[PDB]
Amino acid sequence: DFLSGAFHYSDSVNPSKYSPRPSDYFGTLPFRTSRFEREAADVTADYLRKWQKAVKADNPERKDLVFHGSTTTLGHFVSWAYPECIPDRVDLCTQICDFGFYWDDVTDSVNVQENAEITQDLALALLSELTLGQRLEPKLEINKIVVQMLWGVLDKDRKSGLEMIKFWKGHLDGQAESAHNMSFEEYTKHRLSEVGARWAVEVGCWSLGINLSREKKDSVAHFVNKGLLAAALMNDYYSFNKEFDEHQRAGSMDRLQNGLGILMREYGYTETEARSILREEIRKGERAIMDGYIAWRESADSSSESHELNRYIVMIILMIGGITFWSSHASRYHRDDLTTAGDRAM
Amino acid sequence: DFLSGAFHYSDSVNPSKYSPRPSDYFGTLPFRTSRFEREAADVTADYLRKWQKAVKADNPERLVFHGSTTTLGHFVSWAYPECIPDRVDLCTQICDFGFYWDDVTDSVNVQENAEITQDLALALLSELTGQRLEPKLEINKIVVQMLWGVLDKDRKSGLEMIKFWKGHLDGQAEHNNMSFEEYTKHRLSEVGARWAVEVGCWSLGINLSREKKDSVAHFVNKGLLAAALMNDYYSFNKEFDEHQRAGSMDRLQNGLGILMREYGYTETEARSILREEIRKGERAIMDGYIAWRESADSSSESHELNRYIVMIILMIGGITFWSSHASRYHRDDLITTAGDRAMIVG
Amino acid sequence: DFLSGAFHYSDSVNPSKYSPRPSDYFGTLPFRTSRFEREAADVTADYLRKWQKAVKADNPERKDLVFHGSTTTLGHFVSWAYPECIPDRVDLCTQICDFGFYWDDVTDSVNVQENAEITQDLALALLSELTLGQRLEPKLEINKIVVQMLWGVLDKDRKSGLEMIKFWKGHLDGQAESAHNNMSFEEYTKHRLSEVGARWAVEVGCWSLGINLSREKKDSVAHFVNKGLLAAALMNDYYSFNKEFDEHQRAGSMDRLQNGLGILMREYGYTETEARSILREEIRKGERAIMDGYIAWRESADSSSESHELNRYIVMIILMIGGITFWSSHASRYHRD
Numbered sequence A: 001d002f003l004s005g006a007f008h009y010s011d012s013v014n015p016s017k018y019s020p021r022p023s024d025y026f027g028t029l030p031f032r033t034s035r036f037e038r039e040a041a042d043v044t045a046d047y048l049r050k051w052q053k054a055v056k057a058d059n060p061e062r063k064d065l066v067f068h069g070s071t072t073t074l075g076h077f078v079s080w081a082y083p084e085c086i087p088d089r090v091d092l093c094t095q096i097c098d099f100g101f102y103w104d105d106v107t108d109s110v111n112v113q114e115n116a117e118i119t120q121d122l123a124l125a126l127l128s129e130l131t132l133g134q135r136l137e138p139k140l141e142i143n144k145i146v147v148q149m150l151w152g153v154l155d156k157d158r159k160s161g162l163e164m165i166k167f168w169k170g171h172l173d174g175q176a177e178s179a180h181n182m183s184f185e186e187y188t189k190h191r192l193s194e195v196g197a198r199w200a201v202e203v204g205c206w207s208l209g210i211n212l213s214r215e216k217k218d219s220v221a222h223f224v225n226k227g228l229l230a231a232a233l234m235n236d237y238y239s240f241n242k243e244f245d246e247h248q249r250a251g252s253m254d255r256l257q258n259g260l261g262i263l264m265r266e267y268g269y270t271e272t273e274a275r276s277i278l279r280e281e282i283r284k285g286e287r288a289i290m291d292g293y294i295a296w297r298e299s300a301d302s303s304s305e306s307h308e309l310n311r312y313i314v315m316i317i318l319m320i321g322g323i324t325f326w327s328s329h330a331s332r333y334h335r336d337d338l339t340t341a342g343d344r345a346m
Numbered sequence B: 001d002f003l004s005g006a007f008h009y010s011d012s013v014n015p016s017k018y019s020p021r022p023s024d025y026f027g028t029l030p031f032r033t034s035r036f037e038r039e040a041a042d043v044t045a046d047y048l049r050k051w052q053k054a055v056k057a058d059n060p061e062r063l064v065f066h067g068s069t070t071t072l073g074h075f076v077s078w079a080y081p082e083c084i085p086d087r088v089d090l091c092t093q094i095c096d097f098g099f100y101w102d103d104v105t106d107s108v109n110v111q112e113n114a115e116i117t118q119d120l121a122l123a124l125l126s127e128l129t130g131q132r133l134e135p136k137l138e139i140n141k142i143v144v145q146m147l148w149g150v151l152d153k154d155r156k157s158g159l160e161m162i163k164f165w166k167g168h169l170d171g172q173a174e175h176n177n178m179s180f181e182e183y184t185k186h187r188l189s190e191v192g193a194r195w196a197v198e199v200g201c202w203s204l205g206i207n208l209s210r211e212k213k214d215s216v217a218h219f220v221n222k223g224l225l226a227a228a229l230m231n232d233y234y235s236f237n238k239e240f241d242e243h244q245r246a247g248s249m250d251r252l253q254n255g256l257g258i259l260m261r262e263y264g265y266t267e268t269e270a271r272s273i274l275r276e277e278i279r280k281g282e283r284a285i286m287d288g289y290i291a292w293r294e295s296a297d298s299s300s301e302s303h304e305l306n307r308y309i310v311m312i313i314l315m316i317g318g319i320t321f322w323s324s325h326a327s328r329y330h331r332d333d334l335i336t337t338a339g340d341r342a343m344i345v346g
Numbered sequence C: 001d002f003l004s005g006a007f008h009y010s011d012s013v014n015p016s017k018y019s020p021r022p023s024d025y026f027g028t029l030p031f032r033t034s035r036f037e038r039e040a041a042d043v044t045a046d047y048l049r050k051w052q053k054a055v056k057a058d059n060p061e062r063k064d065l066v067f068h069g070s071t072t073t074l075g076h077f078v079s080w081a082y083p084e085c086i087p088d089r090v091d092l093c094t095q096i097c098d099f100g101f102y103w104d105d106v107t108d109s110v111n112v113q114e115n116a117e118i119t120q121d122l123a124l125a126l127l128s129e130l131t132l133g134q135r136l137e138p139k140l141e142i143n144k145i146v147v148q149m150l151w152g153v154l155d156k157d158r159k160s161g162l163e164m165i166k167f168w169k170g171h172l173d174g175q176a177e178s179a180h181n182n183m184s185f186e187e188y189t190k191h192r193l194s195e196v197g198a199r200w201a202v203e204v205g206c207w208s209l210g211i212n213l214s215r216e217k218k219d220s221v222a223h224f225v226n227k228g229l230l231a232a233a234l235m236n237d238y239y240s241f242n243k244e245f246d247e248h249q250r251a252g253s254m255d256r257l258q259n260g261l262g263i264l265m266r267e268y269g270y271t272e273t274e275a276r277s278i279l280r281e282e283i284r285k286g287e288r289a290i291m292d293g294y295i296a297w298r299e300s301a302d303s304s305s306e307s308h309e310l311n312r313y314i315v316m317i318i319l320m321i322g323g324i325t326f327w328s329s330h331a332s333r334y335h336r337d
């Protein structure tokens, strides 16, 4: 490990400090925590009430308004995901992440037709801040909400926020193609475009205040993408149970994105079998971005731009670590209101 | 846009040429102003006294009533611009009696409300059959002279008006946390819009088969719905105040209170929803009217229907402007403020 | 900067909601319109026809009976000046005010000899209501009217009426002194406040609103009230100068013109623009003194019946000045081409 660089807003941490410990954490990357956990959790509690108004307003006949976001019983998605987030950017960071969670929740379980309708309505807002034209307002209350947030982000760092908004619109395109369910190698390629990892990294950039040519960021992708692949397969491992229940409960199994699904269906593996295969791809990826890190850190310049690039890879590594630990116990994936193992082996 | 037909007793007027200009008018429907505003205002002042007499007679151990007159015009003159000039007297009585009766029935308890409802219905049934079963309350006792007056002018039209009045009595005899969808069903039936239409029918002398009037109800009703919501919007402040100092806060049902309770909308978030719903309604009666004119032939059947529809549109037009500045709603003697009505946000 | 208490007969307004808009309004105190303008303008349209018949009775020579009173194209002096005037007192409140106007007209432009004649005469009708014995009646038809009027007033409320009448006679005493205008600005402001009728206006407001407050309690707030009334007089001098100059020229009484603008121009050689600017400043100073003084009084005030009346008293005045100002900014009495 030995993450180079100074940390001004976080402290090194361990699963050991948390109790009760998570049932199945097996990450190999380190992670930290912001000193700003309670502010983040306070913001996630207000944004929920917010979001739930918007959701009720688009569909007043549905009553389940249960959404699982950043706050868990041990900590918070933001505090672990982006430990070096700037204190006055914690708030807006929490809104982005949580909105990302909720928006995902009401778009990746519906029929590709209901998804297209909503995906378009969002892109209107985002494109509104990238072009010189006049604004186009979204029609769904769940997307209207996003406008005031994009202004906040851009008022903190416009250069950073414009680019994060760019890769957000890239995520939108990625999850609009999620209409069928593919080989394994064809799935790993589809899932990196659909998970929101590229957008996740740029939310870190804006969060941390990192200014860095797209060239330099690409100059390290070859291994950083292996790390990012790891986090996706990691998400599939932890979010598979709840995702089954949901796509079964909704009649969308058709479009269900998860490597357990792929490994257990095409290939005839079992849940345990596919799980075992996944645990090891996750290791491989975790190990390649970490290794890619040191390899980079020892043949490198002492330039101002070199120091920033290290800051950007440390931000990525730390984020996979923190979300790995977050994912291991988060309500969003480990809810006891869920289908079973025998039920999903069918 | 275009209202078809000739006008004989009224002139078109701009929310603009009025002085003092109302604070908050946003109606999208046209309205006219009778040329006999003066006459109506005189009747209102005389009927005020008669009502006061009756109301002191009926409760000698206890107020103010805010009827049709405003600093800028008169309810009847706007609500019923084309009222036949010799029917303004009795129309002004009808409306003012409606305004006052509502005050002494929608603020008391179900027990009291029922008794007064009961006693007034005795007066209506009497002229709708049989032996006259006369009213015992001084406040209800006064509609008798009124009714003979109405039927003397026009028996066929006054009876139908009388039928729908009774229907309104049935209306306002019925929940708090119902759904806005369920609230609009109830409120349309309890706001007396159908009665209001038939008062206009009597006023203008409209002879139109019941089956003909129902033919266009599918779009007329959406403008009436708009009007009840528009009423809700202007009367929420005074209505909250009244029920506050009575104890009867749960007694009140109002589109804003329901939006503020169902969803956790603030009053300001609710007035904005209500406004768009009011516009949706105003637009709808107008698009229905246009559709109907595109199909309707040039006979007499069609001439009368056109007057009826144009009558309703103008009625909604004028009451909105009336409603935007009448002391009944914007009286400046409330002990409660925006801060107090924020407490119902849940 | 918010007046407390409940408003029963009036609605807030301001210049923005008015059209056509007055060209030269610079008021800083708030104002309201009564809901009973219809009544007010009806009594005005009737009183006028009944006052020119007494003036023509008094002078059958008299040519023009033009008298610009309480009605304007945007409102009415009473609806604005006395917004909370009890509904059944609006009629009589209008008689009192139009009479005050028309009587001003036929006495404050003639020579002083003619003015005492008319003043001493009306004084007979007042005094006769302030005494229990000696009842003298007026001999002029213009003054004969006030008999029945004072009857209506005293019938609606004796205690308020009587005080109003004292201050009325007090107004007659004051304008009986405006014989010259060779004074300093200091001299003028003290003489004018005594002769502009503001004190009587306040009591007309007390009777119209039915305020029951002791004279000792009204004096605890004179120190700031009076700076508002002074301002209200300079405001009148400001808007009513052009028409006054005109008539005093007309009447050959150019040395009786009571007007701070005149005194700034003639005795200090300011120019209109200069003198108007000076006036606008003094008005704001007064306008702010009453409002600051009331704010400061309200904050240390307790809730007793006596203090709610005092609050009513001060608010009425503040609204009265605010209301009369908007009125003076467009009324025919001063803007009539």
Ligand SMILES: CC[N+](CC)(CC)Cc1ccccc1
Residues within 6 Å of the ligand: A096, A097, A098, A099, A100, A101, A103, A104, A195, A196, A197, A199, A200, A203
């Ligand atoms: C919409 C995508 N996402 C990715 C985790 C929900 C699955 C939101 C999100 C983006 C970036 C960081 C955190 C959450």
Ligand SMILES: CC[N+](CC)(CC)Cc1ccccc1
Residues within 6 Å of the ligand: B094, B095, B098, B099, B100, B102, B103, B190, B191, B192, B193, B195, B196, B199
């Ligand atoms: C406007 C509705 N209102 C007001 C008091 C009570 C429901 C009676 C009314 C109905 C129809 C015409 C005029 C008045």
Ligand SMILES: CC[N+](CC)(CC)Cc1ccccc1
Residues within 6 Å of the ligand: C096, C097, C099, C100, C101, C104, C196, C197, C198, C200, C201, C202, C204
């Ligand atoms: C001179 C008296 N005044 C007012 C200043 C006419 C100019 C009559 C009046 C008295 C009280 C209130 C309103 C008018």
Ligand SMILES: [Mg+2]
Residues within 6 Å of the ligand: A104, A105, A108
């Ligand atoms: Mg999902």
Ligand SMILES: [Mg+2]
Residues within 6 Å of the ligand: A104, A108, A175, A194, A257
């Ligand atoms: Mg998804």
Ligand SMILES: [Mg+2]
Residues within 6 Å of the ligand: A235, A236, A239, A240, A243, A258
């Ligand atoms: Mg998943």
Ligand SMILES: [Mg+2]
Residues within 6 Å of the ligand: B102, B106, B172, B190, B191
């Ligand atoms: Mg009602």
Ligand SMILES: [Mg+2]
Residues within 6 Å of the ligand: B102, B103, B106
């Ligand atoms: Mg009511």
Ligand SMILES: [Mg+2]
Residues within 6 Å of the ligand: B231, B232, B235, B236, B239
């Ligand atoms: Mg209402």
Ligand SMILES: [Mg+2]
Residues within 6 Å of the ligand: C104, C105, C108
């Ligand atoms: Mg004068």
Ligand SMILES: [Mg+2]
Residues within 6 Å of the ligand: C104, C108, C175
């Ligand atoms: Mg004078």
Ligand SMILES: [Mg+2]
Residues within 6 Å of the ligand: C236, C237, C240, C241, C244, C258, C259
């Ligand atoms: Mg003057």
